[PDB]
Amino acid sequence: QFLRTDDEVVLQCSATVLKEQLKLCLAAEGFRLCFLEPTSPDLAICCFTLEQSLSVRALQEMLANHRTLLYGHAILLRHAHSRMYLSCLTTSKLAFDVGLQEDATGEACWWTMHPASKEGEKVRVGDDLILVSVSSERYLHLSTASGELQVDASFMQTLWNMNP
Numbered sequence: 001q002f003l004r005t006d007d008e009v010v011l012q013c014s015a016t017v018l019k020e021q022l023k024l025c026l027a028a029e030g031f032r033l034c035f036l037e038p039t040s041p042d043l044a045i046c047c048f049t050l051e052q053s054l055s056v057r058a059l060q061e062m063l064a065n066h067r068t069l070l071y072g073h074a075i076l077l078r079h080a081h082s083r084m085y086l087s088c089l090t091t092s093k094l095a096f097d098v099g100l101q102e103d104a105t106g107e108a109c110w111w112t113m114h115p116a117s118k119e120g121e122k123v124r125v126g127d128d129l130i131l132v133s134v135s136s137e138r139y140l141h142l143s144t145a146s147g148e149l150q151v152d153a154s155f156m157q158t159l160w161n162m163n164p
Contacts, residue, residue: 002122003162005053005067008080010046012039012161013142015149024142026151030082033089033099036142036149047080051104059110059134069123074112074134076104085109088133088153095143095154096136107135116159128159 003009011026013036024036027045037046052075053067059074069075077086079100087101087108101109115121116128123129131140138153140160 001125003050003069003125003164005050005069007050007164008047009050009077009162009164010043011048011077011140012163013158015142015144017144017149024149026086028079028082028084028086028100030084030100032082032084033097034086034151036151044081048077048086049080050075051078052076056112063107069113071113071115071119071121071123074110076109077111086111088136088138092152093154095141095152096133096138098140098151098153108133110134111140123162126161126163129162130157131160 013024015022015024023039025039025046026034027037028034029045053069053073055073084100084102085104089097089099091097111131113123114130133153136153139157141152141154141156142158143150143152
């Protein structure tokens with residue numbers, strides 16, 4: 001089974017905190033910066049819909065003016081609860097915060113998918129994914145510094161899983 005557009009998904013990554021394996025998933029509220037909640041958790045605040053998936057040139061064309069996800073394509077993720085969009089924020093080190101945006105205007109809310117180790121191939125459900133910001137060219141990153149499990153956009157890469 002392959003990932004398709006208009007699919008409700010949860011973005012999940014792995015972490016080794018205190019010699020113990022953790023399964024964390026991306027969450028956000030309405031009133032906003034994103035956070036990571038360990039699985040055992042209210043899915044409503046974790047649900048993202050794959051609104052769009054366009055190639056590099058198609059996105060550049062749109063910016064200048066059932067579908068299957070492929071590697072290289074840029075995706076648009078809509079927070080199901082607040083109807084807002086996952087974007088790379090201007091606020092923060094040279095890393096950037098990741099929160100919610102109120103519109104699909106600009107590059108910030110666009111992320112490109114890249115494979116771990118195996119372009120143009122279909123993105124399978126339950127796969128290792130490299131998500132890259134279009135506006136800042138930074139990877140969606142798990143930071144576990146100072147005991148805070150925060151999500152940001154930096155030059156360090158974190159593998160993500162997208163499951164419906």
